[PDB]
Amino acid sequence: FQKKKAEVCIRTSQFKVNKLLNRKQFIVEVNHPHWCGTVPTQLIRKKLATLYKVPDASQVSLFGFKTKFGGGKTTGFGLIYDDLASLKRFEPNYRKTRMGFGKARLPARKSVKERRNRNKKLRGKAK
């Protein structure tokens, strides 16, 4: 055992270009032998941005990372959109919330249900 700085390497598989949704689809697996814990998604996003030479790191969407039993590996799914505008248009709201730019949470669904059921008794401007 020799102490050394923990360095992660990014490998992609099952790569596909999805021109319908203006993005690239692939499976990303990370080898982190001496990493203490789990590799945060932000670091993997930066390394994928450097690897694929996409101009902006925020164009990369990552999710569903599973750490392999025993350590040293982590496999997830990645998306690289053609531009940031395309990522904001096509990504689901919860993934955009993880990346930072997401819609504010809606009010509790029970409150909406109760308001809707009260209005069904009303009629006109009162509703």
């Binding site: 055992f1 039993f69 025993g70 350590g71």
Partner: protein
């Protein structure tokens, strides 16, 4: 409700609960292979009974029967791949001669002990459950892991283990922390 995840049992209890010959024989196996409970032996018993039941059905069929050819080939392939039968014996009749020690010798606990990585079968058991044994660079913590012949040469200490190429274990680390405080 509306969950379709199948599951099945893997062992059965013996018909006669108190048979001194069976109790002594099972006590021998438990001590010899370091087994936790009789359920591990009975799990091996069901595996053997299913294999022999399949073999007896196939051996009934004519030797040129397509089902016998396909499934007989698969059964022999499985026995050879997992080391139950040696490569010398290739007939379907040799599957019927398999015994409980044949399967138990293929457990990772026995293989680790026989390989010299452990001093005893009990040392092998705790080594496996403590994430020290790796098969093809993959840490295996299951003692009942049946080792294939191909994977037998790839068994060694885990790279993340203190006995392999990993950091120091708990007692050394705690002692170092105490020394730093002291």
């Amino acid at each position: 409700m509306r969950n379709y995840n199948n599951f099945n049992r893997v062992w059965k209890a013996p018909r006669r609960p108190f048979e001194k010959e069976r109790l002594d024989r099972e006590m021998k196996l438990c001590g010899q292979y370091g087994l936790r409970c009789k359920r591990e032996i009975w799990r091996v018993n069901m595996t053997l009974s299913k294999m022999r039941r399949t073999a007896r059905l196939l051996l009934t069929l004519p030797e040129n029967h397509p089902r016998r050819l396909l499934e007989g080939s698969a059964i022999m392939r499985r026995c050879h791949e997992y080391g139950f039968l040696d490569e010398e014996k290739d007939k379907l009749d040799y599957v019927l001669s398999l015994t409980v020690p044949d399967i138990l010798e293929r457990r990772l606990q026995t293989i680790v002990f026989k390989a010299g990585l452990a001093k005893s079968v009990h040392h092998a058991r705790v080594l496996i459950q403590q994430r020290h044994i790796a098969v093809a660079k993959q840490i295996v913590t299951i003692p009942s892991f049946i080792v294939r012949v191909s994977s037998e040469r790839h068994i060694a200490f885990a790279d993340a283990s203190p006995f392999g190429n990993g950091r120091t274990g708990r007692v050394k680390r705690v002692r170092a922390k105490a020394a730093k405080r002291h």
